[PDB]
Structures are given as structure tokens and as C-alpha cells.
Design a protein around this ligand. Structure first.
Ligand code: FES
Ligand code: FES
Ligand code: FES
Ligand SMILES: [Mg+2]
Ligand SMILES: [Mg+2]
Ligand SMILES: [Mg+2]
Lengths: 575, 575, 575
């Protein structure tokens, strides 16, 4: 684009009119030199920091680095706190407030005199929500990731965030660990500022952002307390000023190819299943046609090479020390699986960015022959039970369970599950299929991460830690097991999942991508005719708004009226 | 000057040696991009903020504004807290630690990789102490003033900092006010972040800094919490980087002409007597020949036109709104008393900065016809009692007392005074001369602001609030009355003041600049023969160091081994 | 002591006088509720944070944590910035400004209304300089250490702070590495906020603070960016308020026993040689009789069990995860070598604090059988060459060099050394003794860490990396080799070291604690007769003060007039 030119912030701050005297004069009460309103890029630094978002605890100091960079490049930096949907505080689930966060971000951007955006994110649902909001404005934007926590250590051994919550709690149910020992582990599990240090959702979404080209190279893996995280933040501050001048917009970066690069990256790293929903939602904002079939297709026969929990052994520190995501992206290029010419926020192509990096640890970023799985991409299951699709993360599942037929053990909701699961009178064995409903977008509500249901204690005492599980819910990115997720349509909207009964047989067949409830179309069709929504609905408030407008996980679980891009035209003046 | 060139910071951060890797590498742990060490000006921002220095409470936020300006200008800002000698916490007196602070500042500057300096100052002693330290290095330096507090208001009346402490305490002694009423006034006396809102030492030194050309024009009068204080700091941050390139040094700015400009400014503003000691000390660092005689000469027949307490009516707020110090400097120019070509830190002459300013209130910045005093300059008294000189601030004195002879009422020290003053049986009247000794640099020690001795209550009960007072001490800039100060040599070093006895007659004659003890040289000389250093002396610590090396107030009360400029040569490498 | 009682802060803030209205009133301009001045403990938080002290870069956030704790316990926290003598910025050497910092800290404490002190430290000289200053006031005080950096990783290998600076520079001289490769290591050498991650001076002095009982248990080893460092800081804030009420003073904690524990602790950890000088200096403030002989005696036959660089293999991270210093103190207790009843700041004895801790890594905190050295205590050498003493760190020395005789190759100063050392024509081999003079307190000046002289490059290419070296200088705790240090009296004051000549033979015998110059007794005396203070001496400034008043390393290199405790009596009133 042409520079110099009149930027949208000048609608507020350029001129001699009464409106400009009002806008410019009031901001000046914070002590800003007059020439800051001379047309230089005005940068909105969107911060998801909060004392109730400990994964983002260091983001104010990151903001200062960003500010410094904007000043250096001759911009005008303004820190703007935005809704922070922390995974670790919000109940019923942070997922329920992602669209709310996305909405407020969109309005904060379009409604206020900023010419460009810096997206300060970290905790799980902060990355997609700001990406959704910024994409729906399509102003020049760039991502700064907070970074993972340092490795957790318990009794001289590695402890992964979230992953060891499942492991220890299941060990306790098996009688192989006491709750007292579990409590002792708490202190040294989260011992620095940052996000979960496994390949969970936050680490995955950081990787997607970088793989999408919406963040500078090397952004994802640097630990929150690492010095180079701050270097990154300041360098990002410099870049956004130039991006605003060059008018480098999200639509030019997040293309279909870019999303394809992102999906294969998810396969290579063995990333969270939540990335599926989040990418679909974000794609729905950019205006790109992206579907579950694209995920299944692109991820097919792409091996996981990142050896981190829950799929592998190590943590984000080792991943970073090995060389981080650029090494992974370079490998994808070498396999001919990368759209090498994909443009990034640096103004350079993704390949030009990563082509010369070195793998410093092949025990962490494995050679292709030694992949944890040959086809690491999340798999999309189709069938009478999931007509709109369901997902599974193969790199953390059990090979002997990937093809499996068993009797359905059914839970009507999470309350139903929690009441039955620890009961020794529960008619269930290791060959049964655990099935749960009413845990989707509308059902839970908000679609909580309860898909990785803990096994029956009497099964766990046999040393059996994996069983086939199916639901219309999510599970933590740090979670594992042969779990089928995002079953669409959910039970709460009358999907076939609603009418699953104890005793019914279910066939799981991942290689053929099929999930089959073994009853006749006749029996199924008549079951659905008698269906009713036996869940509690809200009468007012945001819970109500959510219940009315939220879509299925198969499309990204967005709000129907929030889909698409609405541009960044400046609204009418207030007086 | 030449730019680009190799700056002194490159001695630390320039090159490829182990030591540079050491120096540069360690600083990088705070997350600094490599190019910050490329030779661009590295700015040391010396902050005198402290929680025990409430007058500088907002200097941390002001440091940030300076930082932003340095970033904008392409420099490398680094905040460095320095010794902060607060007037309101330090005992026996903040004055005793001025040289200590000055000592520490000099070493912090020369020993560390800064190419230029920003001096964040406010409370009384902070401004000169940082100026002394910086002058003895002569790197490009610039002053940022914290600023005065807002006006205090008590019971529908303006209350000035410090000035109403003397007034109320004397009113309580006069029985015209209760201590209870005094305590109630405290809450609304200091009600914003900043320094004393009268023409005290802080406001005076702020004006001296600007009058010397060591601060951007308009620096002195801006209130601490006013938005334009923040604008100023950021602009200062921009300017210091250019000053480093141009190598604009204090020695080039603080010339004899500048010090003369400062003196006439002090007269015009009716500034504190403490400016004498501070300017003499600062002159002693730059290497400028400045004496008490210079003070007397330059200030003579310079009228006070600034109508602020303790001399006048209003406060720093009105002074700022009237137009502040630039209006005052312009008036000096119109009277032909200004060295118009004196260079300032802005690169412009003092006249070029002030030549176009407007007086917005002549009730505050008075016209020459309406001046408070025609010869407002501090007067230097000579004579047998003050062989090396003594001073008095005429603009806060009583006209009928400037020429006066009276019986001496003698106090041997502050303890003696405190024991005798409130005794109704004390033989004293309004015509007596109150005399106190052993309150100088060595005597007190530290030369406290105890010179403005409260009058005997039986004299105050006559509605008489002024008496002739003589001592070797200082007094607050907020203080008033016909008080003779800085009597040199002090009694503790055997000055004639030491042997004054009750009954002796004392002649005060300001127009003839004379201070005479009316006894024969024979009687005086024989009295001195019996003099001894009648004090309990310290054997160690800084108090001892002070006792051994401190000079008289007639030369600025510096430490003998601290006088002069020692340059800014980098010492040997540490490794 | 009895509570409630009148604390020293009440001299400022307790009562109804004019002075109290002044003192209390001014601090109120920063927005403090009145009851904060009711006599509750006023805590001075002494912060050595500075942008030019990157090792203490995160101390403001710890200061905030300390503040929160003080509030909780019902105190009145006030942050007070103090002089920060960073090893990595100050030249000629930070050591020259350790005493300057101690003076300023002392005066800031005694001169201001604080009832207790929190010492925020990190970088080498910050800990002892503040401990000296606080000890000379003897108010209730407690230490918070910033904490070490994370491990440096370059090309999949551990890099220790400082230690690998010496190693690589010698490797480059040996031709085993290029300088270009050295620069690539810079980025990943210091990659988090904190001090050297080896057992350097900072880690040593941090351990001394904890071993003395002047910090909460576990304070020394916690990484700067670890969450529990912040927990530590807040708990310290709570504790200091209680310490002030109980009046728990440094003199009660830093007893002869406490210093003995610290010395024995230093041996176990294989700590820096600088701990000798610093402990001697600090003991001289408390008024405890401590000498070099105490060091020699207490350290003899105490084995180093800490497996960290430069003595061992690992870094402070591994040390912390293993259990840190409490485990080390426990082992001394188990060996019967600990003064178990020594009181600590927690109000409990050191044994009560550590007796139940667990060793989580026996490869890092070694069992006695696998100690690096059997007698790990620093050894004191005596003889004609060092009549007042010299020291050596055995755990990082070469066993085969501990008893050794060789031709002395003499360098007259650091300039002499650097001019000759890299010359291939220099007559020297692996059996010669490298000797350098004029690097002591007065000589250098400031006694730099240059004692570990790099070997001749032609010697290094033979694979010989250690030589016996002698000087009057210091060396980094991160340094290693058979190096003789702190030779007293120094050459600059006419010590026998001054008259050493090329060709002289020197006998080193650590078991017999002897250092012998092989010349006749007569020849030495006549050599000294020709000695002159052949240095460029300062004529003014602090450099002059240093030259006039600094003592030898044999007593801690303090300033002679600063020794001892001068108490904390509140000074005379300021008005
Ligand atoms: S909760 Fe923030 S990343 Fe797991
Ligand atoms: S008290 Fe700080 S300026 Fe008067
Ligand atoms: S330099 Fe600050 S700790 Fe080593
Ligand atoms: Mg989650
Ligand atoms: Mg004063
Ligand atoms: Mg050291």
C-alpha cells in the first residue's frame, strides 16, 4: 500500500473540527506529545492479561516490550485490556465464553481509533478468541504468545500440565496412589508464569498461529519466563508499525493454503483436538471454506514427529531447545506437504523463514522413521452415530482400540456419569464402550472438556488404563486415550447420539473412518421421533443467548450471527 | 559534533571479546534485541523516586515517559535509581546527605555504560545533588523536574507547604490557634503528588535548573500531577539522545553567564537562600568561579515580581498559570539583565526560548511598578561577626528591621534554644537580636533548617511576628522573617559567632551589607583564645567522614575531596 | 521485646507536634490512610533493582510481593531503592563500590523512619554491601535473594554462567574453538532474569545469607523466574513485621556460630573465594571476631558435596530441584558439623528449619563418599610471600599442583600481563608459576577479578589447562584452577609480592599451608628498601577516598572508618 496515507485513526485525531479537539484533547490528559497524532500508525495492544488468568500472568511486562517496539518504529502504542477467557477459572467452561470474548474484541477494534493490532494471548481460549475477533475486522494483526510454563517436577521426575492430572487421579482410583501424594505434587507442577507445558491447546494454538503465519517465526515454543520471549514481543512491536504502513491484513495471510499448512502442522506436532473447532471457527471469520473433510484429508498419513506429552515423553522446554516449530515446518516443506510460498506477517514466505533452521534434538523432534504414529492427523469419523462427524487424536490413542466393537455403557449427562462410574455395581468391563451425551455446545452447556472420562476403578485395578469412549464433548489438549469427540449433531439438538442405549453395540473403525451404531435405520429413525431435550435451559442472560445461536462443533461452534468478516469501517461520530 | 561515532558505552557493548559478550550478554537476560547495542546512545535515567520521598512519588511514571521518548529517538533507555535525600524523612537533616548523594551519583555515571543522563529530581536536595554528580562527569545531561503539589486549601483559605507550618505553629504559641486546629489542617495541606507548592527550595532549584539552561523551557512550574509534566518528560527523553550525538555537555551549558542568569532569576522569583549554597557547590563541580560576592552583586536591584509565599500571596499553581519561569526570564531580558545568548539543553539560547511568552496574570507575576521589593536579591553581609559572609532573604524580611541595632539574646545550640525560648521569665523583647550557634555543617551536624527560630510567645502575643535572628544554620525556602543565615565561619570551627555573649550589641545594616558585633577587636581576639571544639564528636561512620572534610556554607558546603570535575573516562575492564 | 511499644518510626510519625504534621503530612500526599502512622511497624524494603543490574531485573516484582506480605501482617511497607554495585556494568570493578553501597545503605536506614529492613539482593556485591549496611544499624532485617538464571543451552549442551566464558576463551586460545562460535553461545547463555546459574559469588553469598540464618529457609537456590521465589518474597514480608515487634536483630542472628556455619556451608557447596572477603567485612560490622584463621580452621576436612560448576558438573537448577541448601545444612547436621541451635530470622533454629528435608538428587548433592574433595574448605596460605595471608579454592584446583615448585614468571600489572601473555616468545611452560601484582584494593584499584590469569596459548595447545597462579587480586566464583589469591599485604602497599622478580622459584604446599618465595631472608629486606608507591594515584573524588581509607583483603577490604556498628539511634530533629 501507499505510504504516507491517511489511516483510520485520523478519523478521530486528524484535523481541526470539534470532534477532533474532543478526541485528541481527552487522550492528551494522559501526557502525550502532540505529534503522536500526526498520522503515524496507532497500534492497539490487545492484552488478555488478568490476575485470574495465571497462564497469562506475565503479559503486562510483555506489553511493555511491545510498546517499546512501537515507539522505536515511530508508532503510537496503546494497551487495551480485552476479555480473557481463562480455561482455569471459568465455569461451566471457558469454551462457553470464547465467542463472547471474540465479540468484545471485534467491537473494541472496530469501534476505537486503532490502525493495527497486537494480540497478546496465552491461555487456551485466548488465542482463538482474539484471532476470531481480529479476523472479523481484517485490520493488520499479529500474535504474541505468552509461552509455556517451565517443566514440572515431582519426586525427581517430569510432570506435565493437565496430563498428570489425569494420570495421577486415575492412579488414585486404581489404589496405586493416595490423594495425599497427589496433593504433594501440586506445589511443583506449575512453577513459572506461562501456559501448560505439554502439547495441549494453548501450545497447539500458539503453533497454529505461527503455522498460519500470524506470528513471527519461533513464537510458539519460547517459555514465558525466557528472555527471548521479551525480544520477540519488542520485535513484534516494531513489525506491526510496518504492517500498518504496508497494510498487511489477515486475509492475505490466513488463506486456504495457510490453514492447510496449519492442519498438517497439527498432525506433525500431535496437537490438541480443540484446534479443529478453533480453526473452523476462525476460518468462518476470514471467509475461507474449511470443513472436517479438509482436516481428515490433510492430516491423513502425516506422522507426528514432536515427542511431547500427552502423545510422547518430553515437554515444551525440550521442544524449544530442539529448535521448536520452525524445525517442524521445515520438515513439512521437505516432505512436499507444505505450501512453501505462504505469506507471513514478517512479509516473507513461511519457507523462507524456516528453510535454514537446525534440529538440535532428534529425541524430541523425531526423524520420520521414528514417528510416534505414521498418520498423526486427527481423524474424522462418519456414520449413523455421527452424521456430521466426530474426531479422534490417534497419536495418543491405543492401537488395539483403534478397531473395536463393544457393548455401549451409556451416561445421560455428566451428573449421570459421576454417579455411576465409581460404583462397583456398574455392569461394565474393559471391552465396553463408554458413551456420554448432553456435553456439547448446548448440552453442557459450553461443551466442557469431559470427553476423556476416567475409567471404572475395577477396570483400572486390572492395569487397564484405556477404553473406547464416545461423546459430543471436548477433552483437554493435555488429555489422552482412545476417545471419540465432537460427535455431531450433539444429543441436546437431537443427534442420533441421544438415543444410544445400554446394550447397543458400537463399531469403531478408524482406518475406514467409520463410527457405527449397530441398529437398523428403522429402529434408529423411530427412536429419534420420540426424542426430547432432557437438559436444563437458561431463560435469560448470555447463557440464553448462547443456547439460541451457538452452532455445532462440526462448523467451529461459532455464533450464527457472528460468522464472517464485517470489515473495519469507522462508525459515525458520537456528537 | 560527529555522528555516527564510537560512544563510551561501546567500551562495554562494542566488539567481539569475551568481556563484551559478558557485558552485552548479561544485560540481554532482560530481553533486549541485539541491535540495541549497535552504538546508538545508551541513556541512563537517574531516578530519585522512593516511597520515603513522597515529593517524588510519581517519578516512576515520569521515568516511563522519558523512556518512551528515548525509544522514539532511537536511544537505549535504562532506569537507574540513585540516592534520594528526602527533606521530609532524613534526620538530623537532608543537607548532611547531599554530598553523599552527589558522591554516589558521580560514580554511578562514570562507572557504568551510559552515554548520556536524565536527572529525575524533585525534593529539595535531590536537584543539586544530582547536578553536582553529573557536572563532575560532564556527559550530556538534562533535568526533569517532578513538579509542585497542588494548592492546599483549609477553611476557605489557601494554605502553602511549609509556609503555613511556621505560621500555624507560631499562632499556636501566640494562643490564637489550637494544636487541634493545626492537626486538622494537615489533611488538606499535602493533597497531591509533588513538591512544596510555595517558593521553597524545590521550586527554587527547579527554576535554577531551568535558569541555568539545564532543563527544557517551562520545566519548573508544571504541577506534578498535571498532564503536561508527562509530555515534558517524553520530550526530554527524545532530546537527550540528540544531545549525546551533539555531545552537548553541562560545561558548555553551565557557564559563568548561566550562573549569573540563575542568580538574577532567584531574585526575580524571590527564591530560597538555600540556592546560594547549592549554586556555589554546583559551580564548584563545573569549575566556574562563583562566590558570595557574585551573589550580592548580581542580585542587587533585581526586583522580586513573583507573588508567591513566603514572600508574597499565591502558590506554584498560580505561577504556572500566569506563565511560569519563561515569563520571568523574558522580563529579565527586557530589563537588559539577561545573558540572552546563553545556550540551553534545547540547543537554543535562553532568550530564543522565552522571547515570545505571555504573562497571563500580573497579580501573580507583577509589573515592575508593583514589585514586592526593588532589590530582592539575597544580600551578603560582611563584618567582624561574619568575616567570610552571611546571608539574608530581603523579600521575606521586614523593611523596618533591615537596619537595626539591638541587645543579643544568645543560645549556645538548638538544645539551649529549645530549653529557654518558651520560658516567660526570659529577658527578651521585640528589639533584641536572637542568636544561635553550632548549627552549621560541623556544628549541628549537617547544617539544619533551624535558622528561622520561633519568637518568644510573649513577643508573639503582642502581635509581633518578626524579630532579627542570626545563626550559622539554614532555613526552609518556605520560611520568612528578618533572618540572617549561613554565618561563616560557623561557631564549631571557631568563627566569631562562637564567642557572642548576652548583652553584646549587634548592628544590622543590609543596604551597607554589614553585620557587626559592637565590641573591640581586642575583646573579640581574647575571647577566641578560650574557644574549643566543644562537641561530642563521632569517631567513625559517615558522620565522622562528614566532620573531617565538609566545608563552610560560604563555598557551598561541599566535601573538599569532591570538588571539581573528574571527567568520564572509562576505567579498566573488570575481567 | 514487649509489644505494643514505641518504635523508632514514631519519632517521625507519632505525636501532635509541628514536626509530626510535617513528617506525617508529606507522606500522606501519596495517599495513605491515617492509621498507617499509628505506630505499626514501618518496613523499609531496600531494593537493588536497576536496569543496569540485569541480575536483579525482576526485583521490583519481588518488592511488590514483599509489600503484599507486609500489608497482610499489619505493617506499613515503603520501597526504598539503594545503591546497586553490579559486577557486569561497573568498571574498573564493582568491588570498588561495595563499600560505597554499604555506606549509603547504612545512612538510608538510620536516617529514615523505618523500624525494620528487607534486603532485596541478587548480583554479587549487592548481598554483602547491603548486609554490611544493615549490620551497622542493627534494626530487624531479613534478606530476599533474586535467584539464579535458568541453565544455558547451546547445541544441546549445558552452559554455565561465567564458567564457560573462561573455558571458551581459553579454548579459542588453544585453537579448539573460533571466536565466531563463541558469539553464537551468547544468545542462549543468559536466557532468564537472575544471577549466575553456577556456584559463583552470587550463589555463594546467597547461600551465606541463608546459612547465616538471615533469610528464610530455602531462599538461596530458588530460580529468579520460579513461582516460589515470589511466594518466598511475600512470606518474608509477613515475617519482618513480626520480627520488628519481637525486635529480632541481626546481632542476635549473625553470631560467631552463624559465621562458622556459613564457612562450613561454603566448603560443602564449594563456594566462591569472595565469600571470605565479604564475610570478613560483614563480621566487622556486627562486631564479631572473625579472622582468616577461622576460615582455615572451619573449612578443613569439610567435603564439597554440591556437584555444580565450576567445581562440579551441574547448575543451580539441578541444585534447587535436589532440595537446595537446606539439604546441605542437614548433611552438616548429620555429620555433627553444624551449630544446630543457631537462631534464624524465622525465630526457629537452623536445625529445626532443615532437619526433615529430603535429597531428591544424589548426583547433584553428593553423598560424603562421592564428594569432589575431602577438604573442600578454602585454604589459607602463609609465608614470606604472603605474611598477612592468601587463599585458594581447592574444589576447583588441580590436586597435582597443590604441592608444586616452579620458576616464577612475573607480571608487574594487568597491562604488563596482557602485553606479554599471548607472545609465543615468552619464556614459560606448564611448570612455571604465573605471578601478577598491583591488582589489590589500592593497586588496581578496587581489586578486580583477574587472578585467574589465562594460560599461554602454546601451553593450552598441549592439552594442559591448569597452572599455579599467584596475585593480589580476586577471581570470579565461576573461575577455576590452582590459583592463589588475596595475597596480603598487596604489592601496592609494599607487600613482599611487589619485589618478586623473573627467575625466582616459588614453593606451594597446601597441606602445610605454606607459600614460599625462594630467596634469602636478607635479599627480601633489601628488595623492600627499594619499594615505592609506583602508581598513578587519584587526587580527588571517591577514588581518592578509596585510595586513602581502604584496608586489605585479609580483613575484608572494608573502609577503616566504616568498621563496627554505630547503632540505629534516631538523629536530631530536622527543624
Ligand atoms: S489453563 Fe492456560 S494453558 Fe492450560
Ligand atoms: S518536602 Fe520535599 S520539597 Fe519540601
Ligand atoms: S554478574 Fe550478576 S550474578 Fe554474576
Ligand atoms: Mg483446555
Ligand atoms: Mg528545605
Ligand atoms: Mg564475583
Amino acid at each position: 500500500a501507499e505510504w504516507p496515507r491517511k489511516l483510520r485513526s485520523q478519523e478521530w485525531y486528524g484535523g481541526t473540527s470539534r470532534d477532533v479537539i474532543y478526541h485528541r484533547g481527552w487522550l492528551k490528559n494522559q501526557g502525550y506529545p502532540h505529534d503522536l497524532f500526526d498520522g503515524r500508525p496507532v497500534i492497539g495492544i490487545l492484552n488478555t492479561w488478568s490476575d485470574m488468568t495465571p497462564c497469562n500472568g506475565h503479559l503486562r511486562e510483555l506489553a511493555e516490550k511491545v510498546k517499546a517496539g512501537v515507539w522505536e518504529a515511530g508508532g503510537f502504542p496503546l494497551e487495551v485490556p480485552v476479555f480473557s477467557a481463562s480455561e482455569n477459572t471459568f465455569r461451566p467452561t471457558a469454551m462457553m465464553y470464547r465467542n463472547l470474548a471474540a465479540l468484545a474484541v471485534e467491537e473494541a477494534i472496530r469501534g476505537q481509533p486503532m490502525d493495527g493490532c497486537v494480540l497478546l494471548v496465552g491461555c487456551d481460549k485466548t488465542t482463538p478468541s482474539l484471532l476470531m475477533g481480529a479476523a472479523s475486522c481484517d485490520l493488520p494483526s499479529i500474535v504474541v504468545t505468552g509461552g509455556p510454563m517451565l517443566n514440572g517436577y515431582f519426586r525427581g521426575e517430569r510432570v506435565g500440565s493437565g496430563t498428570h492430572l489425569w494420570k495421577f487421579s486415575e492412579m488414585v482410583k486404581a489404589g496405586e496412589m493416595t490423594q495425599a501424594e497427589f496433593l504433594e505434587a501440586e506445589a511443583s507442577m506449575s512453577r513459572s508464569s506461562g501456559t501448560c507445558n505439554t502439547m495441549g491447546t494453548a501450545s497447539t494454538m500458539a503453533s497454529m498461529a505461527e503455522a498460519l503465519g500470524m506470528a513471527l517465526s519461533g513464537n510458539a515454543a519460547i517459555p514465558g519466563v525466557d528472555s527471548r520471549r521479551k525480544v520477540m514481543a519488542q520485535l513484534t512491536g516494531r513489525r506491526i508499525v510496518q504492517m500498518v504502513k504496508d497494510d498487511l491484513k489477515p486475509s492475505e495471510i490466513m488463506t486456504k493454503q495457510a490453514f492447510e499448512n496449519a492442519i498438517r502442522t497439527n498432525a506433525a506436532i500431535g496437537g490438541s483436538t480443540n484446534a479443529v473447532i478453533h480453526l473452523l471457527a476462525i476460518a468462518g471469520r476470514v471467509g475461507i471454506d474449511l470443513s472436517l473433510d479438509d482436516w481428515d484429508r490433510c492430516g491423513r498419513d502425516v506422522p507426528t514427529i514432536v515427542n511431547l506429552m500427552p502423545s510422547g515423553k518430553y515437554l515444551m522446554e525440550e521442544f524449544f531447545y530442539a529448535g521448536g516449530l520452525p524445525v517442524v515446518l521445515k520438515r513439512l516443506g521437505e516432505a512436499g506437504l507444505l505450501h512453501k510460498d505462504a505469506l507471513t506477517v514478517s512479509g516473507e514466505t513461511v519457507w523462507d523463514e524456516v528453510k535454514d533452521v537446525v534440529n538440535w534434538n532428534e529425541d524430541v523432534i523425531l526423524p520420520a522413521e521414528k514417528a510416534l504414529t505414521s498418520s498423526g492427523g486427527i481423524v474424522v469419523l462418519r456414520g449413523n452415530l455421527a452424521p456430521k462427524g466426530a474426531v479422534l487424536k490417534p497419536s495418543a490413542a491405543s492401537p488395539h482400540l483403534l478397531v473395536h466393537k463393544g457393548r455401549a455403557v451409556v451416561f445421560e449427562d455428566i451428573d449421570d456419569y459421576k454417579a455411576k462410574i465409581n460404583d462397583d455395581n456398574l455392569d461394565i468391563d474393559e471391552n465396553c464402550i463408554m458413551v456420554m451425551k448432553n456435553c456439547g455446545p448446548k448440552g453442557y452447556p459450553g461443551m466442557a472438556e469431559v470427553g476423556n472420562m476416567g475409567l471404572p476403578p475395577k477396570v483400572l485395578k486390572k492395569g487397564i488404563l484405556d477404553m473406547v469412549r464416545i461423546s459430543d464433548a471436548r477433552m483437554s489438549g493435555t488429555a489422552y486415550g482412545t476417545v471419540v469427540l465432537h460427535t455431531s449433531p450433539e444429543a441436546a439438538v437431537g443427534g442420533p447420539l441421544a438415543v444410544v442405549k445400554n446394550g447397543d453395540m458400537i463399531e469403531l473403525d478408524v482406518p475406514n473412518r467409520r463410527l457405527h451404531l449397530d441398529i437398523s435405520d428403522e429402529e434408529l429413525a423411530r427412536r429419534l421421533a420420540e426424542w426430547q431435550p432432557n437438559h436444563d435451559l437458561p431463560t435469560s442472560g448470555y447463557a440464553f443467548l448462547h443456547q439460541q445461536h451457538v452452532e455445532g462443533a462440526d462448523t467451529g461452534a461459532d455464533l450464527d450471527f457472528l460468522k464472517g468478516c464485517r470489515g473495519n469501517a469507522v462508525g459515525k461520530d458520537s456528537h
